[model samples]
Target: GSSGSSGVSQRPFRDRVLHLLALRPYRKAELLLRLQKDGLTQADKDALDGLLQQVANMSAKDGTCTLQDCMYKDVQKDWPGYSEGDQQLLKRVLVRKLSGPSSG
Candidate 1:
């Protein structure tokens, strides 16, 4: 088969807007920029890069990310298994934070 890299099913995976990591061809730097808005904050922006590089080792180039297979569940396979603090960082900074304050 010929998987000619042309486009990415961007919005499709975006539906998961929770823990799903869009492993697209976005430059990790630029990717982080967008990620900074939705997934994380600017608290320790630089730190995010450390984690990104490690995880991104799998899907380096090829911005033409698809719908299902390129998502976190797929990326996680190549992930170096987050340990303790690493695990926290993944969810804390690299993941979306619910803004709804406790009302009840």
Candidate 2:
């Protein structure tokens, strides 16, 4: 879901890109910066934060993150009060994106 600069929730979250080729792949840092500059609402940020945590746990290699990884950082930068629960939710979403089911 996209939102105006006010940083409010507008709609349910949906993967703008799920396909490998269509996905705008970027490193964690790069992805975050772009999301902040583009259109990352608090709701989006909350979801992203959760996904990043999950990705970090699932990742076997260090310094490796999918597109969701980068998006989380950008959201946190803009919204400092990003909660732990929010991060967990984001992680779940990321896992779901990757495998279709986060935890059954």
Candidate 3:
């Protein structure tokens, strides 16, 4: 299967994010990690924020999606291997991240 590109000639990144969300709820950390794989350029960072905002807007409309902020304890439980700084970064990013669409 071919996912569309994020340019004038194709679909935007939101399509891909929506597809992923349709499958299951996604954590901020998870989404950030996936976005990072695209390359740590300014474009990637902006895309991350834009995707998150779109998810938030969708969630606001449906009232089913959620963006759970990770507590330090929760981060420790989920990512024990990561350093304190990394955990802190994750905490910051997850604080404003959005979950996926709801499942039936």
For lDDT, the strongest prediction is: 3
lDDT of 3 at 19: 36
26-83, model 1: which lDDT tens digit per residue? 4545555555554555643565455445444425455422223233443331233234
TM-score for each model: 0.31, 0.32, 0.36
Q: Write candidate 2's Cα lDDT for 21-103 as tens digits.
A: 11334444554555566477777567765655544322456544454533433332223223465456555555545455455
Best by TM-score: 3
Clashes of each: 1, 8, 0
In order, candidate lDDTs are 0.39, 0.42, 0.44
Instruction: State model 1's lDDT.
Output: 0.39
- Evaluation by lDDT, superior candidate among 1 and 2: 2
Residue 2 lDDT in candidate 2: 31
TM-score of 1: 0.31
The candidate 1 region of ten consecutive residues with least summed lDDT is: 10-19
